[PDB]
Amino acid sequence: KNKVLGRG
Amino acid sequence: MAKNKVLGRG
Amino acid sequence: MAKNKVLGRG
Amino acid sequence: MAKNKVLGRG
Amino acid sequence: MMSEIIAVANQKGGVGKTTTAVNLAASLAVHEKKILLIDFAPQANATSSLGFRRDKIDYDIYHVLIGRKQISQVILKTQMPFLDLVPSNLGLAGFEKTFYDSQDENKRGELMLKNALESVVGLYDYIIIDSPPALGPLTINSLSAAHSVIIPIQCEFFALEGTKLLLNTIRMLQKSTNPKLKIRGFLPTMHVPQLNLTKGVLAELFKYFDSEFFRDSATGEYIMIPKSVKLAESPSFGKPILLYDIKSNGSIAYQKLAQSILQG
Amino acid sequence: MMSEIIAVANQKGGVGKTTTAVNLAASLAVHEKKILLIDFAPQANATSSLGFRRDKIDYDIYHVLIGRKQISQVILKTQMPFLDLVPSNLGLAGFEKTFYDSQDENKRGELMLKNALESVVGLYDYIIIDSPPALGPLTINSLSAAHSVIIPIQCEFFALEGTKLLLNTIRMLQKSTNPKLKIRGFLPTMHVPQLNLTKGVLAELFKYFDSEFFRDSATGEYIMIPKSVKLAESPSFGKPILLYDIKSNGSIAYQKLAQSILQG
Amino acid sequence: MMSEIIAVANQKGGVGKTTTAVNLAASLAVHEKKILLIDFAPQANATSSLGFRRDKIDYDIYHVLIGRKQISQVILKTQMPFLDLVPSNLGLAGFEKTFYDSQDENKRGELMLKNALESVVGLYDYIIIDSPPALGPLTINSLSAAHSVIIPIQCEFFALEGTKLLLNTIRMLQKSTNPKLKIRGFLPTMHVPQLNLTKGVLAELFKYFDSEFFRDSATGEYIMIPKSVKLAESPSFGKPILLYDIKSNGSIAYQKLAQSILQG
Amino acid sequence: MMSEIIAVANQKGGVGKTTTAVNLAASLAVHEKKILLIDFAPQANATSSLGFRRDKIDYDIYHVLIGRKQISQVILKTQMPFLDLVPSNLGLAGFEKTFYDSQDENKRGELMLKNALESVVGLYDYIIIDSPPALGPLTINSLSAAHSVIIPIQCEFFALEGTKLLLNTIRMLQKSTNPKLKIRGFLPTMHVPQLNLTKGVLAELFKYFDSEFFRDSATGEYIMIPKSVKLAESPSFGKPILLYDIKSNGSIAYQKLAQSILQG
DNA sequence: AGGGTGTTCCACGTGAAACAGGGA
DNA sequence: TCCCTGTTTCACGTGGAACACCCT
Ligand SMILES: Nc1ncnc2c1ncn2[C@@H]1O[C@H](COP(=O)(O)OP(=O)(O)OP(=O)(O)O)[C@@H](O)[C@H]1O
Ligand SMILES: Nc1ncnc2c1ncn2[C@@H]1O[C@H](COP(=O)(O)OP(=O)(O)OP(=O)(O)O)[C@@H](O)[C@H]1O
Ligand SMILES: Nc1ncnc2c1ncn2[C@@H]1O[C@H](COP(=O)(O)OP(=O)(O)OP(=O)(O)O)[C@@H](O)[C@H]1O
Ligand SMILES: Nc1ncnc2c1ncn2[C@@H]1O[C@H](COP(=O)(O)OP(=O)(O)OP(=O)(O)O)[C@@H](O)[C@H]1O
Ligand SMILES: [Mg+2]
Ligand SMILES: [Mg+2]
Ligand SMILES: [Mg+2]
Ligand SMILES: [Mg+2]
């Protein structure tokens, strides 16, 4: 459960 | 070294 | 390095 | 020098 | 216990400060040690190396030195569980005006980073500071806040004159601002062994500085970060080399440097 | 007569700034042009590249900007007959105070180098300025003293973000302090054409910037300075590359650069 | 069909005869001509150059000249489809006896190799013979067998008298045994052009023999085999330089040599 | 006392037989010992190395072998008073016919050099024999007439098959015609140590032969004769390297060889 | 013209880095 | 698609040999 994507 | 039936080099 | 006055370096 | 008759030589 | 604060500083440009500061902090963290990496440079290469683009984060280290925020808020969790980052941005370069007007009052301007780190020193095992290329205010704050300092040395000609300059800047603060300040070690970087410039620059350095070169426990030999293009590749993926190629020579050498620093 | 003032600038450290500024100024003096090399960085590597180590500098570039000296008083003659040098010192770090206490009222401090050059601009064909690794008051002064700018680009990952920052600093000064400032070019440096990262960085750069990279005005091929340890050895002898080793790869690349300057 | 029989001959030891005879035979084999390499020395380096250890060979060149085995029954296929080999072995040193019991009555034993050859002489484009370091019965046979002769000249002092002795042996045979025998050319081998002795040996030889040295059929330059340790390493793998390293200077020189032969 | 007779022998062409035989004989003679060099080769390169022309010699060693002269007459005084020479020419190529005739009465023919040497062995400390490139009748005589035997080895591929083959020729006579016969030592010649061929060929030779390699008394370093083009240019002046360039590395190495032979 | 220099020019080994296709 | 390989390419150091001025 790492939720909504920033990063990459 | 793979072949080696013809003495062998290659 | 063989003649002039001052600046060296060299 | 050397025997005269110059040959090779030194 | 409390944090050892290690500044990674050399005023020569591009000798590997950010790569050293990024990969040592990551190599220390996989030993289950709590690590805070501070990107103390306005170019903000350490932040980019962990994969935080400049416009994603609201408030930075400049805003902590100003006092808009306390350092506790601006801290980010990284890809590593044990690695935290105080990120930077080019707005940090505006601290330099704020420096010469804060030495104008209490002579307190050297210690702005040190006073900012006080809230977070019992919260980390190691605090790694990435300093920019100059002997000016940001590097002085970095050095005045530190227990110890790593010197990266690109083994080429300008390092002879240059390293010497940094030591007597360090020696100046050891008799004034930060008396407990230590040289943690000398770290050969971008190292190609075969070169006659590299041998001769290291020979001259070993004359004066040999005791302070980072050495290994298990071998006894020098710790030298090899020239490896994989280390240069790694920040393009938002990663320390440890998370890129763990087997590569440069990753091996950063994990060796981790092990020396943990040992004492 | 009028000098074309060229800045060599990048805020990223250790990318070839000094090595360009010294070897371009030499390669232009070869062609019988009158050349002033201004070492504008506190570390003063350009001065040490020419064999003037400093205990021997009476007064330097810092003393001109005070009004303590006039620029004709500090100009030194070098080994190359057509090359002259304005030396630099550790004292140039204290110009940073002189700048920031002039922005409170007068606000004119970005022009301090330009007005120091007014005395010598008629006497030189080219004036080459070497700037430190930062976007602070030293680079800004020289970027606003300059007619044009050469950007040395080391082909690793931080060049991508860093270039676009420097150009934005250039665009800001193009709209305010120095409207006549042009980009003379982008010079790839420490070039190793085989590396994927080198290919990878150049591709993202040529995407946006290709019309700005240096070209041979004969063949049309890109002008890149190759990674050659002879350019790294050359300042240890106090020489530019063409006096050290004139047939080497780097000297040819620096010669080709001066010919691509001397026309357009 | 008419094969063209070529002797590679010098009585001076260690001048490149086997290296020439093996690598010319190979360089002609890749032009799609059918090539028979007859290794005519007791040491049998040419055989060993093609990767036949001397336990493998049941019946050799020596058994043909006896009338023990017929010539077609001793011919080996090599690693190239267009090269065939008649091997040797230490038993070839017993020819020297057989020649002196053939002249107790008949006197015609100088033709024993020529007569052995006529059975395979329609089946080949080129038959290269490799001859031992002496002017005795083996060399004399292969000289009286051959249509032409390539002379390897290591350019050092003893090449002066030994060439003259070899040309005098050759011209003695143009009178008696082989009137059709003509000098195909002189090949400088192990060539190091910078040496004063190499210059010196060539100058004296050119004085007498210049039109006999091998020339390139286009550029008119002398064909010389450079000193290359790649040609020396090559028989350790049982390969000609072509299969081993086709781009090295020794291979290019031997290919260039095959083109000059292939003209006319 | 009595003469030690040393055969300098190898079957391989051009490994340095004549050069070691000329230069060891001279390096032993400079010590003020009496030395006879015997040119046992039809090429007569040894005779050419000491400054004798093939038309200056009235009678040669071939004339001693048939019995037309005894060896005491044929002996020439060379440039050095301690070095004498039994010269040769191409006439000695006629001994081989006279060998299979002289093996056909008795056990005689292999020993004709041994029986010719008997009159002069009380007259010299060392008698040095220079052998031809073959294992036939001349090398056999040379090996049968001798006490100790020098094998020069060019460290390149054909020496591996070659020296193992000569050793078996040696061990046959050690069981037969000359049980006194011993191997004096292995002499690396033409030596360039950097080559991986040279490294590998000397490696394979070492696991079989290391005890039999020529070594210094003062160190225990191997005695190896370097590539020196001065050794090549010396016979052109009619001189040993000692009378030519005595400072040069090849001269030093032959004098080392002399020195360690003298202790036995 | 001798016995030194140090400078230039060449072959050859060394190792990083790319990549080729063989790994199944 | 990671993977181990062997190969190809290229900078750089090494040393022999020539040579050019330097010594007297
Ligand atoms: N061991 C190494 N091998 C190869 N490349 C490296 C190595 N270490 C660092 N680099 C690369 O070298 C460049 C300079 O390194 P880095 O950015 O770490 O230096 P810096 O001291 O932080 O520079 P600045 O002074 O600009 O802050 C970077 O492009 C990085 O990708
Ligand atoms: N093409 C090249 N090949 C090898 N080394 C080089 C090259 N160009 C420059 N260098 C060397 O690279 C190092 C860094 O280059 P340089 O010091 O010119 O960069 P800089 O941008 O002036 O550094 P700073 O950021 O400290 O001003 C120096 O030690 C120099 O000797
Ligand atoms: N052009 C060359 N460059 C370098 N090495 C070479 C060259 N030609 C031959 N060689 C090597 O030199 C040695 C002598 O050469 P080679 O054996 O061909 O001469 P040869 O005349 O056949 O000698 P022999 O007198 O024994 O018949 C061999 O070890 C070979 O590997
Ligand atoms: N150490 C050395 N360095 C350079 N050249 C050498 C060396 N030793 C011998 N030579 C030269 O190498 C060549 C071959 O050597 P040499 O004639 O001594 O061999 P060899 O065994 O006598 O040959 P052959 O089988 O023809 O009698 C000669 O031209 C000689 O001038
Ligand atoms: Mg950085
Ligand atoms: Mg600089
Ligand atoms: Mg041969
Ligand atoms: Mg000989």
Author numbering:
A (entry chain N): 3 to 10
B (entry chain K), C (entry chain M), D (entry chain L): 1 to 10
E (entry chain B), F (entry chain A), G (entry chain C), H (entry chain D): 1 to 264
What does the paper say about this structure?
The ParABS system, composed of ParA (an ATPase), ParB (a DNA binding protein), and parS (a centromere-like DNA), regulates bacterial chromosome partition. In Helicobacter pylori, ParA and ParB homologs are encoded as HpSoj and HpSpo0J (HpParA and HpParB), respectively. ParA forms as a dimer in the ATP-bound state that can bind to nsDNA through a continuous basic binding patch formed by arginine/lysine residues. The partition complex interacts with the nucleoid-bound ParA forming the nucleoprotein ParA–ParB–DNA complex, known as the nucleoid–adaptor complex (NAC).
To investigate the molecular mechanism of NAC formation, we determined the crystal structure of the HpParAD41A–DNA in complex with residues 1–10 (1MAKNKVLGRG10) of the HpParB N-terminus (HpParBN10), referred to as the HpParAD41A–DNA–HpParBN10 complex. The overall structure revealed that one HpParAD41A dimers binds to one 24-bps DNA, exhibiting the same architecture as the HpParAD41A–DNA complex. Additionally, each HpParAD41A binds to one HpParBN10 peptide, as confirmed by the electron density map. The HpParBN10 is located near the dimer interface but is inclined towards two loops, loop α2α3 (L23) and β3β4 (L34). The HpParBN10 is clamped by the two flexible loops, L23 and L34, of HpParAD41A. Moreover, Arg9 is oriented towards the phenyl group of HpParAD41A Phe52, forming a specific cation-π interaction between the amino group and the phenyl group. Furthermore, the main chain of HpParBN10 Arg9 interacts with HpParAD41A Gln79 at L34, providing an additional interaction that stabilizes the HpParBN10. When superimposing the four protomers of the asymmetry unit in the HpParAD41A-DNA-HpParBN10 complex, only HpParBN10 Arg9 is located precisely in the same position, while the remaining part of HpParBN10 exhibits different conformations due to the peptide's flexibility. The binding of HpParBN10 may not affect the formation of the ATP-sandwich dimer or the HpParA-DNA complex. The HpParAD41A-DNA-HpParBN10 complex represents the first ParA, ParB and DNA ternary complex (NAC) within the ParABS superfamily.
